[PDB]
């Protein structure tokens, strides 16, 4: 979740421009963002983001069951830009925003906003109220064309903060050998146990949680790291970059 | 504690199933819950929950020493279901339950119960006396197969409501540089103070409470937010789910 | 803006005499400046500048729309000359000067004045109240014929300090190929996305902000750097040079 990024990465955007969500949300899926080409200083504007996907397709949940997807994002704005205060957000805009609670990536990064998890059904499109800075009061900001970086995700990740794989990813053979057995993990607790008899005769047992479907058969020989299941993931992460000009007014 | 969730989260369960304890109890540790396949209306059934862990493995305590772990949990029951009143719990069951005090998440949420902190050595397994609602009198409940969500934790968390870290977690360098000095935080209580000479001459001192162990030496160089200690945490949070059929008496 | 020059160029005039505004305001447009041929020591005189342009012609704004042009300038006076303080400017002149706030290029360069952005509608002609030095006190100056350099602009520039293009300039193809598609960058705010399929099947997408007009069509084949739009710029930067004699009054 955005909280996983926050708790494990001080900067959500890596040197090459990759947003850290990608370190765990391994599938790529297009997203979009639009902001006005230009805005006056100390003015509230809207950032409209889209995280499209097929609402009819459900995902594997942590409990192994199928369910709806949820969305989240991280928006990296120029230094000085901030989430617009509620007292600066017009009712018409609060209406478009809805019941969302944008938060700064950290108290020391008010220019980086996150939100989520929130229902994909209702928030595949979101509006972010942003307050532009004033170069006349903030020496760290100028009347320039500034880049804006966006990262948007839908669906559960493939790996956890501890490095363990979630049940929403591909599982591969720990060793090469003949599959001598495939046992159902339980009755309520789905999953499987794949026994691989190595060339030396030792048997290893690979545990596979419920979620992914097996693509291997008993008696089948597999190579080490060969996929033993398909990929159950139906979600993905996408990035988009845009820009905005902080106008320099004067009459 | 379960109270932290109560004081900070209105709903302990998020849309995808994640239970809020996960926000501060970063370690994942399986748990189990079992209830009868079905139950008649207005009847007391027992929910048996387990929070297994090696009782021989001591955890880091707040004072810096190693000691026993406590357990806690949040149980999400369908509306209408509540803790069975004492006058409805048979002597036999009260004896199994023990001196546990299950409390509603809030006065308006009797269908959500919590317990803890309580000694894991004595409560690694618990019995919760539940009273099934009566569709005949409660129109908000019907004869359906109802889900039951459980979240159980053992061991101290890694972060508090305000973001501060406990001493039962990993401490990382607050800045990149070379460790020019490592001093004891407390002469007698342990803990450390690692002085890091930044790449700009400026020296910073990172305080490390007693509890975790240092994995860096004097003169060593470290990167921004690089592990200065191990991860002392031996506990964990886990979620389990189940279901029960609210039976309609024939005749 | 004049501030871009101030923040990026220590000296607004290069050795060859080109004024730094020209590094970003690529269209040359005549300007005029007049100062009397001579002035007495410690005397307030006027510099009358003209930044002519067709007031009926609107320019492209940063937001993509059309609007008025702002003007600004840099005035390089001989060492010792400065903006005449208010107490030394006759109401007659202050009235001509209007509500303009001439400022030194930097605190150390009182002899170099800048102003703007200000509306060209009202300030296409400006009056600058200058105080001549006195070789009797400022021995760094004498009774000579001194050069004066002027740089005046109107309209938005073509490139920012970081090299990014503004939307008030020509956009060219990033690579040679055939335009396989042209879509709106913004559904309601304009702008375009030109898809160029180059020889080896690869496709690149050039983003053109709202402002310039496309001079190309889908199905058309272009060459690298070939203009994809017109030049929306209707403003311009001009320089002028004059001189003034610091008189040595009979004694
Ligand atoms: C970082 C800014 C970031 C975003 C964006 C993000 C979003 C996100 C959402 C919306 C969910 C819920 C999806 C759903 O369909 O329910 C979610 C879930 C998981 N994430 Fe995530 N996530 C971001 C970053 C990261 C990082 C850096 C990690 C881990 C270190 C990570 C991992 C995961 C995992 C695992 C899940 C699934 C949780 C589960 O229910 O099993 N994410 N993320
Ligand atoms: C919510 C339902 C929830 C549970 C379950 C839970 C349990 C729990 C226990 C039983 C302890 C004590 C364990 C021990 O060995 O002493 C405990 C301790 C801490 N918790 Fe917790 N906790 C739940 C939720 C949360 C939340 C949301 C936070 C904070 C915002 C949180 C944090 C912590 C921390 C830190 C501790 C350590 C306290 C200390 O001894 O210093 N918990 N929790
Ligand atoms: C320096 C002495 C200098 C002057 C004079 C000048 C003036 C100027 C004005 C008055 C404007 C506003 C015009 C309008 O119609 O809105 C303006 C705008 C831009 N400038 Fe400029 N400018 C001078 C110098 C420079 C320099 C050296 C740069 C860049 C490093 C530069 C660039 C631009 C750009 C681009 C703009 C457009 C800003 C926008 O509205 O998007 N100028 N300048």
UniProtKB/Swiss-Prot annotation, chains A, B, C:
Protein location: Plastid, Chloroplast thylakoid membrane
UniProt GO BP: photosynthesis
Cofactor field: heme
Superkingdom of this protein's organism: Eukaryota
Cofactor binding note of this UniProt entry: Binds 1 heme group covalently.
Binding site residues for heme: 1, 21, 24-25
GO CC term (a single one): chloroplast thylakoid membrane
Membrane topology of this protein: Single-pass membrane protein
GO molecular function: electron transfer activity; heme binding; iron ion binding
Keyword Signal assigned: yes
Statement: the UniProt record of this protein carries the keyword Glycosyltransferase: no
Keyword annotations from UniProtKB, A to Z: Chloroplast, Electron transport, Heme, Iron, Membrane, Metal-binding, Photosynthesis, Plastid, Signal, Thylakoid, Transmembrane, Transmembrane helix, Transport
Subunit structure: The 4 large subunits of the cytochrome b6-f complex are cytochrome b6, subunit IV (17 kDa polypeptide, petD), cytochrome f and the Rieske protein, while the 4 small subunits are PetG, PetL, PetM and PetN. The complex functions as a dimer.
Family according to the record: Belongs to the cytochrome f family.
Function according to Swiss-Prot or TrEMBL: Component of the cytochrome b6-f complex, which mediates electron transfer between photosystem II (PSII) and photosystem I (PSI), cyclic electron flow around PSI, and state transitions.
The protein's name in its UniProt record: Cytochrome f
Residues represented out of the complete protein: 32 to 282 of 317
């Amino acid at each position: 979740y955005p909280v996983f990024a926050q708790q494990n990465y001080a900067n959500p955007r890596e040197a090459n421009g990759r947003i850290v969500c990608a370190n765990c949300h391994l599938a790529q899926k297009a997203v979009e963002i639009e902001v006005p080409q230009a805005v006056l200083p100390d003015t509230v504007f809207e950032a409209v983001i889209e995280l499209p996907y097929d609402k009819q397709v459900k995902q594997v949940l942590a409990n192994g069951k199928k369910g709806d997807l949820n969305v989240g994002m991280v928006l990296i704005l120029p230094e000085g830009f901030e989430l617009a205060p509620p007292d600066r957000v017009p009712a018409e805009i609060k209406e478009k925003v809805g019941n969302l609670y944008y938060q700064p990536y950290s108290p020391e990064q008010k220019n980086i906003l996150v939100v989520g998890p929130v229902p994909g059904k209702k928030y595949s499109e979101m509006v972010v109220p942003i307050l532009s800075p004033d170069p006349a009061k903030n020496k760290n900001v100028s009347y320039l064309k500034y880049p804006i970086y966006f990262g948007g995700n839908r669906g559960r990740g493939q790996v956890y903060p501890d490095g363990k794989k979630s049940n929403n990813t591909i599982y591969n053979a720990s060793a090469a050998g003949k599959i001598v057995a495939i046992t159902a993990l339980s009755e309520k607790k789905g999953g499987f146990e794949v026994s691989i008899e190595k060339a030396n005769g030792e048997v290893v047992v690979d545990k596979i949680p419920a979620g992914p479907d097996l693509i291997v058969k008993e008696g089948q020989t597999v190579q080490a790291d060969q996929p033993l299941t398909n990929n159950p993931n139906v979600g993905g992460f996408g990035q988009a970059e845009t820009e905005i000009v902080l106008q320099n007014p004067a009459r």
